[PDB]
Every structure is written in C-alpha cells, then in structure tokens.
Design a protein around this ligand. Sequence first.
Ligand SMILES: OC[C@H](O[C@H]1CCCN(Cc2nc3ccccc3[nH]2)[C@H]1c1ccccc1)c1cc(Cl)cc(Cl)c1
Ligand SMILES: [Cl-]
Length: 467
Amino acid sequence: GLIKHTEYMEFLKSVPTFQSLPEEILSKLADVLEETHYENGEYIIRQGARGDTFFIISKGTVNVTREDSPSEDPVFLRTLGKGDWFGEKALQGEDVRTANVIAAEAVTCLVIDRDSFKHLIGGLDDVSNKAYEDAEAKAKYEAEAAFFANLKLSDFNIIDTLGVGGFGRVELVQLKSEESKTFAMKILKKRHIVDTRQQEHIRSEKQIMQGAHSDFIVRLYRTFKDSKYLYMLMEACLGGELWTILRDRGSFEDSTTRFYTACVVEAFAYLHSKGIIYRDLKPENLILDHRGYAKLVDFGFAKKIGFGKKTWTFCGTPEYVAPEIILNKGHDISADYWSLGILMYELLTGSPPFSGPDPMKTYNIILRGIDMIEFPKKIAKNAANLIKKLCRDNPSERLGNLKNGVKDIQKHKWFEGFNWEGLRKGTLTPPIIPSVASPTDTSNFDSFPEDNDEPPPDDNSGWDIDF
Ligand SMILES: OC[C@H](O[C@H]1CCCN(Cc2nc3ccccc3[nH]2)[C@H]1c1ccccc1)c1cc(Cl)cc(Cl)c1
Ligand SMILES: [Cl-]
C-alpha cells in the first residue's frame, strides 16, 4: 500500500547506487518489490541452484560463501548487510547460482524476479531510460577496477615490444587466463623518473589516464610496482605509431589529416570538459588502433586545473610550446588549441612551422607568430585559415577558447562535410586501414632488440605508494 510504497521509496533513496536514479523508476520499483523473510542460518540462495530472483537487503546480514570443488571445504567471501544486494546475474538469464547466501541473523530482503524486472524495464524512452543506462555505465567501471585489482604481473606473458626509449619500454602482454585479451604494458625505470624529476608528472598521469573514458584516449586499467620499475596496463592499439606512418608516408592529405585532427578534437573536448590540459600533443603522442582510429597515449605533462585558474610549468618539446608558456604568463586549456594548429601543419607538410637549431632559437620564431610565416601551397586555403585561428598569440582570442568552445573548431569551414557523428559512433571509414591479423600482431611497429643491459638501481623512497 501507500505506507509500504513510501517505506520502500525512503529505503531505496538510502541505497548507494539506487539513490541517484529518477523518482519514476524508484516508485515503479516500490510498486513491484516484494518482501521475503529468513531466520538465522537459513539459505537464501544455494550454490548450484537455478534462480530468477534478485535481492536487496532491507534488514539483517547474510554471509556469502562458495565451494571451488565437491571434495574441498567451502570458502567464505564476504558479509553483506542493509543496502547491499546479490543475485543480479539471475535477471539477465543466467539461472545457475555460483555462491551460497546464508542469513547471519533475522534477514528481510526486497525481491524482484527476472520477469517483473524485464517488464519494469520499458519506461519512458529518453526520460527514465536516460539516467538508467548512464547509472549502469558508471557502475561498470568500479567492477572493471575490481577485475584488474585481483590480477598480478605473474598473470601475463610478453608477446613482443612495441616501443623503447630512455624511459624504459612498452611491451605487448597477453593475459594468461585469456589468449584473445592483449594489452600494452608500459614499463618505466624509476631512477629515470627520479633523475628527470617526473614523480608528480607520473603520479598525475596515473590519476588522469585511469579516470578517463574516451574512445579517443588509450585506456589505463591499472598499474603495478616493484623496487625497480613502474608497470602500466593499457589497451593495445595495434594499428601503429602515428609518427612512424607519417615518417614512412612523408606527409598526409587534407582528408587524412582531417580524420586525425578530428580524433584529437574529440579527445580534447572530453579532457577540457573535466578541466584537464594535455600539453604534450605531437605525432609521437598519437597511436592508431586495428580499425585505424587514433587515440592520445601519453599523459605525462597533462594537468587537472580548476575552472578560471592558470598553471605555470615550463615543459614540452619546443616546437609545440604555446607563446604564453614561453612568456611565463599563465596557461590553461587554451594552449591545447595552439598545439592542434601546429599538429595540422606538420601532418600536411611533414615539418612543424616553428623550428630553430636549439630550444631558445625555436622559442624566438614562435614569439614572431603564425602571421609571420608563409604557408606552403600544399596547405589548403581552409586548413591554413584554421591553423591561423588556432595559433593566435592571445590565448583569449584563440579558436576553441571563445564564445562556443570546441564547437567553434568543429563548425569551421575545413570541417564542412565531416561526419562528426559517425566518428563518435565508430562508423566513419578511416583514411589509413591497418593490417592486424590477430591480437598478437605487432607487424605495424618497428623491430626492437631485447634488453641485454642490466636493470636500474632500486628506488624504495615511497613516492610510488599509490601505484
Ligand atoms: O542488472 C540489474 C540492475 O543492476 C543493479 C544491481 C546490480 C548492480 N548494478 C550495477 C552494475 N551494473 C554493472 C554492469 C557491468 C558490470 C558491473 C555492474 N554493476 C545495479 C544497477 C543500478 C542502477 C542502474 C543499473 C544497474 C538493476 C537496476 C535497477 Cl535500476 C534496479 C534493479 Cl532491481 C536492478
Ligand atoms: Cl573508452
């Protein structure tokens, strides 16, 4: 009735994930949630039983257990209480139960069967169904952390090397439990991080790349650590390094450059919506996937910055540094729009616009401006017009940092005919289609010799505590 319905309504509002949901759904749940009771030691669920009902705990506690074999004692897993739940696989179709749920005292559950759950599912098209699908997406990422949190470096095999540098190297790893699942394992020498004073640069890289969920940014699942190296488990983008494709091809066509520039625009639009400056854009920071879709890979120089505030660190490759960084005036999200203009220019000509024989000479030609450079005939009138709008000296006057934000870059003449929606959907046909025969295919990468040198010194300082 009305009392019991409001009591279920007031209860669901106190449950961690169910409180964020619309009132429509909460009332529809409270109409069909049934109340079941159990005394101490009573089995709510038995392992191996076939079931169609989900349970939320309204009163008491239960003890979740599981036996891994017939002739092996049952293992204890956890103790759930008020607001917790269990049995949710039963709602998709999976009948067989994989763990025993025993009552620890007098327990009361609010229950819903698969049929009743499946029929409540079918509310308002984009009103009720909007926040539900977003709540189940938001929920999946804590479960992804839990999956990777149980693994160890010992659960992986090295397939082949993807990259090598002074930093360490990127190895293609294969999960032992699943031969179809491949990841890029970036292994970093800790003394190189300490020698370069990159402790916080990498501490922020972990925080940002794990927090990010863009199809235009390489995913970072988790990290590991030992006394010598930091290990970073990311997604495998087997399409190849953009800087090698650009090297092998020399330069890129207007249409080819457009697709890659657009992939960056979406990546930036995501980062900028969270107050994150990238600051490291250059062909080296881009990697294609097996479809030929580009993603940003290194977040070493990226920084989370509050809305309306500036940062003052002087870093980055001299050819991509914005004027406000050089001038020790502050800088924000708007420096990434400058980098987009520089990236466009190099992708179309094979060489960026500002370059001197050393950093200080390069910084002098950047300060003279984009208006002081003659654009080759190769660069199309529209591409050149966009590069000049993105490379304006004043960060306030810059395209992307004006009235409409990143939509002003998206809406530019150069982008007329560009299917922005098919790019976000993944249906737009890329310009360079890579040949990836399997998840273990590193043929789109350079050949790297095996590390024969001895390992670096230990580092047990403790700045790696979070890894
Ligand atoms: O699958 C059932 C679905 O799952 C619940 C109960 C089980 C956990 N999950 C969150 C969740 N979704 C995941 C998807 C993938 C991996 C882990 C995940 N955890 C919850 C949730 C909460 C709000 C919106 C969507 C789902 C459910 C949704 C709602 Cl709104 C109401 C009920 Cl009674 C049941
Ligand atoms: Cl993603």
